[PDB]
Amino acid sequence: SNMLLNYVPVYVMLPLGVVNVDNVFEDPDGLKEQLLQLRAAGVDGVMVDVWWGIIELKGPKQYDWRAYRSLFQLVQECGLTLQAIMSFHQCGGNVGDIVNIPIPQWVLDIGESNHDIFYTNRSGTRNKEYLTVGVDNEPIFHGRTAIEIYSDYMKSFRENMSDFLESGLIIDIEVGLGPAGELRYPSYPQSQGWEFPRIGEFQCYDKYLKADFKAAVARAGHPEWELPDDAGKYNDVPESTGFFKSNGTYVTEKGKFFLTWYSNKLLNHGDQILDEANKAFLGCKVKLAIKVSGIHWWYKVENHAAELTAGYYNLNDRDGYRPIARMLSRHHAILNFTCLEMRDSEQPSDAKSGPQELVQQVLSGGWREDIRVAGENALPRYDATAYNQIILNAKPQGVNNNGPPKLSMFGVTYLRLSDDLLQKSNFNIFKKFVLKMHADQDYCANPQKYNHAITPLKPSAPKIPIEVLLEATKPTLPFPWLPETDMKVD
Numbered sequence: 001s002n003m004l005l006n007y008v009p010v011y012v013m014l015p016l017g018v019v020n021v022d023n024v025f026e027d028p029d030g031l032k033e034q035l036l037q038l039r040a041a042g043v044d045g046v047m048v049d050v051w052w053g054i055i056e057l058k059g060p061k062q063y064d065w066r067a068y069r070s071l072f073q074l075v076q077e078c079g080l081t082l083q084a085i086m087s088f089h090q091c092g093g094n095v096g097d098i099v100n101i102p103i104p105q106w107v108l109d110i111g112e113s114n115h116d117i118f119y120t121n122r123s124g125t126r127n128k129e130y131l132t133v134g135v136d137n138e139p140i141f142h143g144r145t146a147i148e149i150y151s152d153y154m155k156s157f158r159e160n161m162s163d164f165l166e167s168g169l170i171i172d173i174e175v176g177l178g179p180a181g182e183l184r185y186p187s188y189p190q191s192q193g194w195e196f197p198r199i200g201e202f203q204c205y206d207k208y209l210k211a212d213f214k215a216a217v218a219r220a221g222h223p224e225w226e227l228p229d230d231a232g233k234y235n236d237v238p239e240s241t242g243f244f245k246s247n248g249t250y251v252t253e254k255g256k257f258f259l260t261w262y263s264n265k266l267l268n269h270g271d272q273i274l275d276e277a278n279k280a281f282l283g284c285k286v287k288l289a290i291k292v293s294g295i296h297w298w299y300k301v302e303n304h305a306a307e308l309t310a311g312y313y314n315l316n317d318r319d320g321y322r323p324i325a326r327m328l329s330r331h332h333a334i335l336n337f338t339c340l341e342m343r344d345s346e347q348p349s350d351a352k353s354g355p356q357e358l359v360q361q362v363l364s365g366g367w368r369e370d371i372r373v374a375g376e377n378a379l380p381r382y383d384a385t386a387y388n389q390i391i392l393n394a395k396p397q398g399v400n401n402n403g404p405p406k407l408s409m410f411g412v413t414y415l416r417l418s419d420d421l422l423q424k425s426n427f428n429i430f431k432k433f434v435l436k437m438h439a440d441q442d443y444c445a446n447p448q449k450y451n452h453a454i455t456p457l458k459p460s461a462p463k464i465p466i467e468v469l470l471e472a473t474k475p476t477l478p479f480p481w482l483p484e485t486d487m488k489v490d
């Protein structure tokens, strides 16, 4: 078999706010010159937020798809494909967020009077960037539940963009499932202080989550159990907490029970919404995808504090990612792992960071459950170092000169298309990165040639029970990585 079978596509994220809060496509001409640059570089496609808070701004079911229609048209004129994010979250409080885009005002209005629709920490701070899982199924939004809102939105998108869907412009629909569009709790909000190598806080204090928790413990036989109260604050270190120190609460029954409850709320949140997405896009030539954050800090300590916290119940003896991957399998979805570039040695020692290990764990789990795996770089990088790291992760065992590689990622979405990137020296490097992702081949317009043809979305396979999902917590050894890519940028 051909080298082309080694190709991994590359996408570029568009700038935040290319459609402003006013639902206006501000600078088509500018963008256009940029896109044309990417097309000549050999880039396969681009990724864009489809902000819920811009589209359904006016009131319920008052969608205005016009400015996005224009943008998609321009992308299509430029010969690029497109990855569309159903962004049901706010833009603004996270790293890199240069523009503020909130959720719909009319939703915000409701929260003015029912504060418990937001994620809440133990101190009672309400985070407005995303609606809490606790209201997925509460019909308090003018008669709709939150899941109905998301679902209606995706249906509308589907019907209103059907021409672009059928012309094959859109290749994947990333379903936003939490803050920054990631399936996670907002445990590390910059907007509340949080600073890097801090552990973050559990976000289950809104009333619906607290009531669910309380009923559940009571059924377990411990009505008396409460939500954690010894876990510290955003910027603690684990050892400084009752919850996470050795022999702390996290390894008690109560803690295990809690952690399981907490992490399972995510799994079910993701499963239910993907169900809705599957039905909305049924028949379309697209794949669905979700985003999983890379919480590499504290990875190297037994407690994995930041991971727990974000709702990833990952320990050294409990795989907290593989169950997500298994969940994705019934929906035929892709796991988009949002941190691919970092090296362990670039982290402060005191953060006990294990980014490379975390990567191998996550991709291996996906590959093992037989799903497709994609990823992004978490932070803006322009150096060969970062690029060669992404290339290694893309094809962990190198290129197969006589067939398809044994392990390969399904795609990688580079972080942001800025002025800096297009600078002459930066862009020259990038061009190389693109070439080596492409395995030394020229850009290949027909994906069928590299074994990526998209077939019409089928219906989801049947619900897998939580027990079965949870079997995937059994630790496995990762697949073997090369120490260095065989296809470096230098």
Ligand SMILES: OC[C@H]1O[C@H](O[C@H]2[C@H](O)[C@@H](O)[C@@H](O[C@H]3[C@H](O)[C@@H](O)[C@@H](O[C@H]4[C@H](O)[C@@H](O)[C@H](O)O[C@@H]4CO)O[C@@H]3CO)O[C@@H]2CO)[C@H](O)[C@@H](O)[C@@H]1O
Residues within 6 Å of the ligand: 013, 016, 048, 049, 085, 087, 090, 091, 092, 094, 095, 096, 097, 179, 180, 181, 182, 196, 291, 292, 293, 294, 295, 296, 338, 339, 376, 377, 378, 379
């Ligand atoms: O336009 C698409 C979306 O883009 C933005 O969200 C993306 C994040 O910016 C990107 O970093 C990533 O998400 C998480 C990373 O996996 C995780 O490592 C972390 O980044 C850390 C970093 O590891 C650490 O060293 C540094 O010092 O602190 C950072 C922590 O904040 O958190 C990231 C976010 O949870 O992928 C996201 C989605 O593509 C926009 O904010 C989002 O609104 C857009 O939808």
